[PDB]
Design an enzyme around this catalytic site. Structure first.
Site, PDB file in Angstrom:
ATOM      1  N   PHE A   1       0.869  -1.214   0.000  1.00 25.93           N
ATOM      2  CA  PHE A   1       0.000   0.000   0.000  1.00 25.93           C
ATOM      3  C   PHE A   1       0.920   1.284   0.000  1.00 25.93           C
ATOM      4  O   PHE A   1       0.605   2.206  -0.795  1.00 25.93           O
ATOM      5  CB  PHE A   1      -0.795  -0.123   1.282  1.00 25.93           C
ATOM      6  CG  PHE A   1      -1.544   1.125   1.710  1.00 25.93           C
ATOM      7  CD1 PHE A   1      -2.441   1.732   0.848  1.00 25.93           C
ATOM      8  CD2 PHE A   1      -1.350   1.651   3.031  1.00 25.93           C
ATOM      9  CE1 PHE A   1      -3.165   2.885   1.298  1.00 25.93           C
ATOM     10  CE2 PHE A   1      -2.074   2.785   3.446  1.00 25.93           C
ATOM     11  CZ  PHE A   1      -2.952   3.393   2.581  1.00 25.93           C
TER      12      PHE A   1
ATOM     13  N   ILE B   1      -1.180   7.273  -2.255  1.00 24.81           N
ATOM     14  CA  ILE B   1      -0.885   8.698  -1.971  1.00 24.81           C
ATOM     15  C   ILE B   1      -0.416   9.011  -0.557  1.00 24.81           C
ATOM     16  O   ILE B   1       0.058  10.099  -0.279  1.00 24.81           O
ATOM     17  CB  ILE B   1      -2.160   9.557  -2.189  1.00 24.81           C
ATOM     18  CG1 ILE B   1      -3.265   9.217  -1.088  1.00 24.81           C
ATOM     19  CG2 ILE B   1      -2.686   9.415  -3.641  1.00 24.81           C
ATOM     20  CD1 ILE B   1      -4.568  10.076  -1.185  1.00 24.81           C
ATOM     21  N   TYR B   2      -0.456   8.028   0.365  1.00 27.08           N
ATOM     22  CA  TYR B   2      -0.533   8.392   1.795  1.00 27.08           C
ATOM     23  C   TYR B   2       0.854   8.512   2.411  1.00 27.08           C
ATOM     24  O   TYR B   2       0.928   9.128   3.489  1.00 27.08           O
ATOM     25  CB  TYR B   2      -1.318   7.325   2.570  1.00 27.08           C
ATOM     26  CG  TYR B   2      -2.748   7.321   2.105  1.00 27.08           C
ATOM     27  CD1 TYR B   2      -3.720   8.286   2.601  1.00 27.08           C
ATOM     28  CD2 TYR B   2      -3.243   6.326   1.288  1.00 27.08           C
ATOM     29  CE1 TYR B   2      -5.072   8.236   2.161  1.00 27.08           C
ATOM     30  CE2 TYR B   2      -4.574   6.268   0.872  1.00 27.08           C
ATOM     31  CZ  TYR B   2      -5.446   7.206   1.361  1.00 27.08           C
ATOM     32  OH  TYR B   2      -6.796   7.197   0.917  1.00 27.08           O
ATOM     33  N   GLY B   3       1.929   7.966   1.841  1.00 27.70           N
ATOM     34  CA  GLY B   3       3.277   7.988   2.500  1.00 27.70           C
ATOM     35  C   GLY B   3       4.129   6.997   1.814  1.00 27.70           C
ATOM     36  O   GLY B   3       3.811   6.569   0.708  1.00 27.70           O
TER      37      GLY B   3
END
Ligand SMILES: C[C@@H](OP(=O)(O)O)[C@H](NC(=O)CCCCCCS)C(=O)O
Ligand SMILES: C[C@@H](OP(=O)(O)O)[C@H](NC(=O)CCCCCCS)C(=O)O
Ligand SMILES: O=S(=O)(O)CCS
Ligand SMILES: [Mg+2]
Ligand SMILES: [Mg+2]
Ligand SMILES: [Mg+2]
Ligand SMILES: [Mg+2]
Ligand SMILES: [Mg+2]
Ligand SMILES: [Mg+2]
Ligand SMILES: [Mg+2]
EC number: 2.8.4.1
Lengths: 548, 442, 246, 442
Positions: D360, D365-367
């Site tokens: 993931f 987009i998250y890290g």
């Protein structure tokens, strides 16, 4: 009787909830929705006023090719579009967080010992009451010693104050009652006797700093602000020199040696000070929720009110803003507190265990985990297969994984009376669900899920901990939605089935039993619905000091 | 030798032990007793077996006021301490004949543990001491009672606390003199985050030993921080020798001359006369009825003034038998000596500045506390590079009972265990003996 | 290899998708050009872009692992890494998200596969992705009503079907023609209009979707009744639990 | 030895070096080459003399885009590199001819610095390496040019950056493979906060040597964190030897058999066949057309499965010569092998769980980011206890140029200096040689 989610499904869609087909693409996109139409209009007004484009429904893909659904807030008859449950648009959700962030618990036991030993002065109910009148003037930001001080406007800080509690009834009786969280009034008799025995003769302050200050600053301000004004009120009420060597012992006790923060500080990659959501352990979040002292003859209602408190705080505000932001994670959380869906599944599990074992009677072992968590996982998954409208409602796999595993984990802990076997039932539910449907959650959902079975009973340095001590900083849990608030519910579940007055910290439980809070912690889902309707009045606003 | 200087070394009763020792024989880089103390500090843990047993029996784990109803476990840990400690020791050691030590105290209620030095030579830092100790005791308790998989996580909570939800071992029933690496105020600070009450507890309130342990830790951190590298090294070594090691019996002789009736000011007068007698300072210029002193050796002036500062602490706080005024002595010994002489005070004003903030943060509402809860990593007292905190340790050794946050309140577990170790309790003896031993290798 | 336990048709279908010696049933023919159009990474006639030079032009030093592992042809050439992504309806689509990633890492070399509830993706070098994508699109991995090629805006796996038996698609990339009973792809997988639509055949009928599906459901084969598959999942739970403890 | 196991050791070409060596001869606690590598990475610093000179001439100090107009200093540091390096060495060393190394590279543009080992045996941790190096170069530059008191603080800023206003050395022109102690996710994690691209740069992208260096650092950290103590110690050692050290030639031989045409699934089938052939697993029960396998040695089954997991990464990401899919291999090798056998995957599910979050956080987009920027201390990849990160190092060594944040982008100063040190570059050679040398002392 109808499953508990039938009324909400009949509200959402024209079809009966069993029906397998529908029609799409003919609703006019965003124009089907009152709230999206409010947003389109407001975007055009915003963009003209400021001279920069902003909300525009024609950017990106066109929302509303399917029904944009209302949601029933579980336990209420309130139905709202999901945007009204976004924390930005819901002042009850913002206030719930501000009331936790701005609270600290601060002992008077060391402080009274410095007064009697170093200063050689007496402490009595009388001198405590005088101190509490003094600190209730000082705490919101007003002066008690120096000339030419300038002060906070009392009406901007009307939500800040200090109360006390003690297990000693005859002091709790002798202190002015405006200042006392009265355990015997607030808790049923059996829970009151447990809590008074835990506190004993200790006397503890519950200090709430102003919401406007918490919002301007951060959670790590709360115990400092509290200790400055306890320090000024100890100097004024006990006649110290205003600043002598003993003044340092009151500061160290109020800031370090007798303070209880709601959250502990975080590691540097997610650097934050105390009283931030990631530092609040799951056991404390269950004790902050006050459903346990109102709804104690219904352990499912108590456990699910804790899930609603934690899904909103940990997924919407914490993971969806502090740790990310944007549109965020409203519906990853709303799945756990709307449409009575988690409620139907958890009441099935509770009945299954009360009939087979009796609450709290099952062996605390893997045989019980395999039995109950598998039975409740298959019940919840069967509902999505029998009711197409239920599957279209909780459309994301992660939402379904969290709801089915919460019911399985809570039910397991209602059988064993132990949260650790409830946690093992949560992970087994994930593994069965993943094989049943050949999917589970989003790309990263089961990082903790696959470490999960092996770390439930580990004892190693950064692996082993009872579930009540874990929180959003336990390493496996530090990143992902659809777990943290459900773990708070599993932490509550065996204690609600046993009738325990608290889950992990009796001082935290008593500290929120207080009708002077802005948010009503005895009815978290009712409050979320009031905020969604734009009917909740928060503290902290600047209206008094801005033009009409 | 890089430096020509020599010093004479004494015991804590003022008797000469070894004359003419090259200054570098006391360097933390060369002296093998400083190496043994520092490695000892890194590897030593106190285990509270009684505390573990009581946390389990009441389910009171994870920090103040915390409890989990229904998780109670009643285990006879102190009654089986010998077997539990032996089983832990076999997991802690690397081999049969290494330097692992596991020793019961208090009838089995406590254990002194020294993790083998070798685990540290292949480690980045020092956290293997509490983490190897804690797991070996958690596994030895589970194995002693055959604790089930369902209940064993309560043993872990009773030993190490709320970690890893908390960053620290919150609620742990083990203790170390060092604290976790994330709490350093800067890189290189770990030997500074050692509470002054833990040095005074380890040394049993012997004033000269508490000052020597504190100075060895502070000045060894100065090397790790790079402060004692190049132009500054000699300053740091002379500070260690004169302020912390009673070099030349300077501290002792100032205290003997001012102990009966002296004040901070009478100590200053004697130290200025001694500096003049030794040729460290000389009159540079006469103003109107005022002599301006100069020095051709600022590091040595600083060291003599540092010895006087320690003696002034011992005279002032020793006379009151009350430690609070050390903040005042650290300020005004330095403020007075600069207007007495025209020369800069100890650490070029940095002791005076540490003392200003320390005084405020030990007499105000804003933070700090009593002298005993400070340390060289505390924001209020990190600023002087080793010349302030040893005086706070000498002052708390001299306190007769004025503090609520005394060493008996904050450091009892550390006292029981760490005062067993001879080089922690009596470091002045060992570092002197070692310096004499290597004196011809410098 | 045995791949998966269980005695249902679902279990045997999951084994078949993983087993490279099982011949995927080919259900429709798609031209090479139309696979490039559906992918949407380059125009028919456009040369493969590169992200780095060809390996031959690199001269890397000696490494026994490099020498033993043959690069895929797109790696030799330096092709960009690109993707294809599918959504599968919970109403009996033949493939499903974890069945895809498990099968892709048994059958395909040099493969980065990701599983989510509403989408499943493979990324690999461009020219090799075009050959794998033809098999994903032409065989029983794909039904044109119950599965969708979608690089964004994936919602639909959990929705009720439309009047035509088609899964929801916010962007309507696959259009069922009620007059002909065939589905045409009218946009590429990221939603841009194609110059000419690509025929994807007729939807499978209900009896054939039940023969081929890999989802367990109460109205098909329920997982709880495949008691040998359940026993293996519970066994792995218990063994992981005990292993993490001692 | 505590354990009975022996392993055959091979080189990076798959040729036998030494037969039947006790497993503990590879233990971080006993092997002298692992000690030399951990002490080397504690004490080694890269100095960018050209970067210092350029920061000074442009006044660009203190972090990205920062500049102080009017503070420019035009100093010929590179042209006088020899004299500056010699002056800094005289401050860095403890004694003449000790283990201090200061060597110019790149015609004086860079320097490899190895601070003496004795400074670490008297330190709590490892920050003396950047701190003593930085101050010795700052003082040698000020002394070379007689920089004035008014200007010298700009030299300090150009060497060590915005520290101590920032917690890190933000904008520094020195680099280490370790990062500051405050950034550890827990105590004991420092040897885990080493970027994957730094290991791939120091080993010059040799796939087996990058996997060995990563496995050495990860499993050494598991000792320091207490995870390899007691019940778990043999599992960790077997993982080191079979996944990181190519014990018994198993990773090599599985790569040889599957490199031409293989997949993650073909490597699983070959590893299950080899575990059955060797008696590590056996059929426990037959279900309907499905064999359930059991084992009487879970730690050895885990080590064979780990070796297969490393060979599956080399076959899958070597075929693509693109690192990104290592997150998928780490997930589905483990997922597929549990349903192929009825036995638990590598690290009892914790490699699979690390790989779900790593997948993931390397495609969202998250890290996170590309595989090279992860490390054992990153929140996404800390969860498996050494069995995941070394496969990321193998995949990045095999990457032919698909990454924007490649080792050329993130690690060029590390590459130029740390790849000079033979034990960091070719640790599989040196650790096997040292294990054979101590084989009859274990
Ligand atoms: C010293 C330290 O307090 P503690 O000793 O850690 O309690 C610190 N406070 C402060 O520095 C207070 C500064 C603001 C009030 C005094 C201003 S002059 C802090 O809260 O972190
Ligand atoms: C991984 C880490 O990001 P970095 O790799 O450090 O950029 C971390 N973010 C997150 O964990 C995001 C969690 C919330 C968004 C995803 C929820 S599933 C953080 O910002 O500190
Ligand atoms: O698609 S991902 O799993 O990366 C994110 C879901 S919000
Ligand atoms: Mg209809
Ligand atoms: Mg109200
Ligand atoms: Mg005199
Ligand atoms: Mg005169
Ligand atoms: Mg063809
Ligand atoms: Mg061979
Ligand atoms: Mg084969």
């Amino acid at each position: 009787a109808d499953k508990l989610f039938i009324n909400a499904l009949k509200k959402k869609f024209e079809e009966s909830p069993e029906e397998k087909k529908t029609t799409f693409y003919t609703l006019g996109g965003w124009k089907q929705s009152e709230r999206k139409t409010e947003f389109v209009n407001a975007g055009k007004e915003v963009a003209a006023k400021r001279g920069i484009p902003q909300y525009n429904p024609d950017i990106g893909t066109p929302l509303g090719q399917r029904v944009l659904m209302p949601y029933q807030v579980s336990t209420t008859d309130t139905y709202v579009e999901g945007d009204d449950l976004h924390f930005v648009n819901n002042a009850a959700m913002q206030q719930m967080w501000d009331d936790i962030r701005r609270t600290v618990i601060v002992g008077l036991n060391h402080a009274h010992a410095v007064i009697e030993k170093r200063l050689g002065k007496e402490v009595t109910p009388e001198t405590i009451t005088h101190y509490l009148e003094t600190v209730n003037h000082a705490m919101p930001g007003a002066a008690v010693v120096q000339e030419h001080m300038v002060e906070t406007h009392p009406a901007l800080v009307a939500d800040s104050y200090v109360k006390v509690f003690t297990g000693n009834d005859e002091i709790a009786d002798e202190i002015d009652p405006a200042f006392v969280i009265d355990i015997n009034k607030q808790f049923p008799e059996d829970q009151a006797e447990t809590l008074k025995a835990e506190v004993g003769d200790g006397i503890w302050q519950v200090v709430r700093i102003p919401t406007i200050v918490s919002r301007t600053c951060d959670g790590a301000t709360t115990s400092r602000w509290s200790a400055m004004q306890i320090g000024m009120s100890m100097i004024s009420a006990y006649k110290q020199a205003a600043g002598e060597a003993a003044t340092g012992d009151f500061a160290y006790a109020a800031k370090h040696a007798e303070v209880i923060h709601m959250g502990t500080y975080l590691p540097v990659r997610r650097a934050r000070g105390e009283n931030e959501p990631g530092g609040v352990p799951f056991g404390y979040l269950a004790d902050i929720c006050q459903s346990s002292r109102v709804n104690y003859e219904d352990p499912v209602r108590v456990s699910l009110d804790v899930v609603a408190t934690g899904a909103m705080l940990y997924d919407q505000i914490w993971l969806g803003s502090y740790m990310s932001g944007g549109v965020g994670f409203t519906q990853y959380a709303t799945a756990a507190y709307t449409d009575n869906i988690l409620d139907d599944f958890t009441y099935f599990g509770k009945e299954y265990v009360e009939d087979k074992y009796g609450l709290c009677e099952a062996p605390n072992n893997m045989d019980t985990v395999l039995d109950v968590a598998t039975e409740v996982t298959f019940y919840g998954l069967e509902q999505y297969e029998e009711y197409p409208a239920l599957l279209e409602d909780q459309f994301g796999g992660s939402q379904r994984a969290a709801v089915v595993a919460a019911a399985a984990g809570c039910s397991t802990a209602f059988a064993t009376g132990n949260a650790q076997t409830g946690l093992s039932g949560w992970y087994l539910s994930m593994y069965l669900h993943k094989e049943q449907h050949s999917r589970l959650g989003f790309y990263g959902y089961d990082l903790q899920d696959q470490c999960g079975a092996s770390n439930v009973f580990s004892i190693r340095g950064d692996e082993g901990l009872p579930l009540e001590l874990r929180g959003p900083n336990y390493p496996n849990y530090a990143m992902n939605v659809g777990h943290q608030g459900e773990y708070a519910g599993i932490s509550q579940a065996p204690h609600a089935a046993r009738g325990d007055a608290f889950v992990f910290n009796p001082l935290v439980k008593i500290a929120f039993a207080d009708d002077n809070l802005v948010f009503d912690f005895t009815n978290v889902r009712g409050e979320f619905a009031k905020g969604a309707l734009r009917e909740f009045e928060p503290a902290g606003e600047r209206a008094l000091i801005t033009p009409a | 030798a890089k430096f020509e200087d020599k010093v004479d070394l004494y015991d804590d009763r003022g008797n000469l032990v070894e004359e003419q020792v090259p200054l570098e024989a006391l360097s933390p880089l060369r002296n093998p007793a400083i190496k043994s103390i520092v490695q000892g500090i890194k590897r030593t843990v106190a285990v509270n077996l009684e505390g573990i047993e009581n946390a389990l029996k009441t389910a009171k784990v994870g920090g103040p006021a915390c409890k989990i109803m229904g998780r109670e476990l009643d285990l006879d840990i102190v009654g089986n301490a010998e077997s539990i400690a032996a089983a832990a020791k076999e997991m802690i050691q690397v081999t049969e004949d290494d330097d692992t030590n596991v020793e019961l105290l208090g009838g089995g209620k406590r254990a002194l543990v020294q993790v083998p030095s070798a685990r540290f030579d292949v480690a980045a830092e020092y956290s293997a001491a509490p983490l190897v100790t804690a797991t070996a005791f958690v596994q030895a308790i589970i194995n002693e009672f055959d604790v089930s998989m369902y209940d064993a996580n309560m043993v872990k909570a009773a030993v190490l606390g709320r970690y890893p939800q908390s960053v620290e071992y919150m609620g742990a029933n083990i203790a170390t003199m060092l604290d976790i690496p994330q709490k350093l105020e800067g890189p290189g600070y770990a030997l500074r985050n050692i509470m002054v009450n833990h040095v005074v507890a380890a040394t049993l309130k012997n004033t000269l030993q508490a000052a020597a342990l504190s100075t060895i830790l502070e000045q060894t951190a100065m090397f790790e921080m790079g402060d004692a590298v190049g132009a500054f090294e000699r300053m740091h070594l002379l500070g260690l020798a004169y302020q912390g090691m009673n070099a030349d019996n300077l501290v002792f002789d100032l205290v003997k001359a001012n102990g009966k009736e002296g004040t901070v000011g009478s100590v200053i007068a004697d130290l200025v006369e001694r500096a003049l007698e030794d040729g460290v300072i000389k009159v540079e210029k006469e103003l109107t009825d005022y002599k301006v002193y100069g020095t051709d050796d600022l590091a040595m002036w600083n060291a003599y003034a540092a010895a006087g500062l320690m003696a002034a602490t011992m005279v002032n706080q020793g006379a009151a038998r009350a430690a609070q005024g050390v903040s005042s002595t650290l300020l005004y010994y330095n403020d007075l000596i600069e207007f007495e002489t025209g020369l800069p005070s100890v650490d070029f004003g940095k002791v005076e500045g540490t003392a200003v903030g320390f005084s405020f943060f030990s007499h105000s509402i804003y933070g700090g506390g009593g002298p005993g809860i400070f340390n060289g990593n505390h924001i209020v007292t990190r600023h002087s590079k080793g010349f302030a905190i040893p005086c706070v340790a000498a002052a708390m050794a001299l306190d007769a009972g004025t503090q609520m946050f005394s060493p008996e309140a904050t450091s009892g577990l550390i006292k029981e265990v760490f005062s067993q170790v001879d080089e922690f309790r009596e470091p002045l003896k060992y570092v002197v003996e070692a310096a004499a031993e290597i004196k011809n290798e410098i | 290899a045995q791949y998966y336990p269980g005695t249902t048709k679902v279990a045997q279908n999951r084994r078949n998708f993983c087993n490279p010696e099982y011949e995927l049933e080919k259900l429709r023919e798609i031209s090479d050009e139309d696979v490039v159009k559906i992918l949407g990474h380059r125009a028919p006639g456009e040369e493969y872009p590169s992200v780095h030079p060809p390996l031959e032009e690199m001269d890397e030093p000696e490494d026994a692992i490099r020498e033993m592992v043959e690069p895929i042809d797109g790696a030799k050439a330096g092709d960009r890494v690109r993707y294809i992504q599918f959504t599968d309806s919970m109403y009996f689509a033949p493939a499903q998200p974890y069945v895809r990633s498990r099968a892709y890492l048994c059958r395909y070399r040099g493969a980065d596969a990701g599983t989510l509830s509403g989408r499943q993706i493979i990324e690999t070098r461009e020219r090799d992705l075009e050959k794998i994508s033809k098999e994903l699109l032409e065989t029983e991995f794909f039904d044109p009503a119950r599965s969708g090629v979608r690089g964004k805006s994936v919602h639909g796996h959990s929705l009720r079907l439309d009047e035509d038996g088609m899964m929801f698609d916010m962007l309507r990339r696959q259009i069922y023609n009620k007059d002909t009973g065939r589905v045409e792809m009218v946009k590429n997988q990221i939603g841009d209009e194609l110059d000419e639509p690509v025929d994807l055949g007729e939807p499978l009928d209900e009896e054939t979707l039940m023969e081929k599906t890999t989802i367990y459901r109460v109205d098909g084969e329920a997982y709880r009744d495949d008691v040998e598959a359940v026993e293996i999942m519970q066994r792995i739970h218990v063994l992981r639990s005990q292993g993490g403890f001692n």
